[PDB]
Amino acid sequence: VVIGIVNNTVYDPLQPELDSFKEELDKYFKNHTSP
Amino acid sequence: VVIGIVNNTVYDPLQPELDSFKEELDKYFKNHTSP
Amino acid sequence: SGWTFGAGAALQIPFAMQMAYRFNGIGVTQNVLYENQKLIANQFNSAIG
């Protein structure tokens, strides 16, 4: 609806504290599957 | 670079959340550690 | 240039997004201008005639 809008990406600020947790939450899922 | 700065700790508002959700996952993670 | 030319050097600014600064100082968010940019323009064009 607005005239002059432009395309870009808005950075989620929960991800930086969760993307590192993706190497924690998801890895903890994989932490006990193999053993 | 700031004159007069002092040392302290800034508790993130997710700290009660992580002790209630991240730790709950960790509690769930630790539930499968023994077997 | 907005009001910037009465308080120092003159800095330009698109007029379409200068009313958004005037709407912000009244108490209405700046999105309401862009939603009704065409409606507001006709009201000002007609009232000046």
Ligand SMILES: *[C@@H]1O[C@H](CO)[C@@H](O[C@@H]2O[C@H](CO)[C@@H](O[C@@H]3O[C@H](CO)[C@@H](O)[C@H](O)[C@@H]3O)[C@H](O)[C@H]2NC(C)=O)[C@H](O)[C@H]1NC(C)=O
């Ligand atoms: C807030 O905490 C930080 C970190 O704990 C303090 O920074 C620390 O300041 C001391 C100042 O005595 C630094 O000790 C220095 O050690 C070097 C050798 O490494 C020595 O050559 C100096 O003469 C001095 O003794 C310490 O390294 C430094 N730590 C870090 C991580 O930077 C800071 O001082 C605290 N704020 C206040 C107001 O005390």
Ligand SMILES: *[C@@H]1O[C@H](CO)[C@@H](O[C@@H]2O[C@H](CO)[C@@H](O)[C@H](O)[C@H]2NC(C)=O)[C@H](O)[C@H]1NC(C)=O
């Ligand atoms: C900004 O991104 C949107 C999303 O892709 C673009 O909208 C597309 O426009 C083309 C026309 O060239 C359509 O074929 C696509 O179907 C549209 N996408 C969607 C999801 O509907 C938009 O064109 C982009 N803005 C600019 C200036 O390129």
Ligand SMILES: *[C@@H]1O[C@H](CO)[C@@H](O[C@@H]2O[C@H](CO)[C@@H](O)[C@H](O)[C@H]2NC(C)=O)[C@H](O)[C@H]1NC(C)=O
């Ligand atoms: C808010 O007020 C404006 C001003 O009257 C309305 O715009 C008019 O709406 C009537 C209704 O169809 C049209 O006949 C006029 O041509 C409109 N004026 C202009 C300048 O376009 C607007 O409809 C009102 N909005 C709501 C949600 O009621």
Ligand SMILES: *[C@@H]1O[C@H](CO)[C@@H](O)[C@H](O)[C@H]1NC(C)=O
């Ligand atoms: C898996 O869990 C153990 C605790 O039993 C922990 O020491 C280890 O760091 C975990 N693995 C990863 C990849 O975090």
Ligand SMILES: *[C@@H]1O[C@H](CO)[C@@H](O)[C@H](O)[C@H]1NC(C)=O
């Ligand atoms: C831990 O796992 C067991 C095995 O199914 C389950 O009975 C128990 O409810 C789990 N504990 C929690 C707190 O969910």
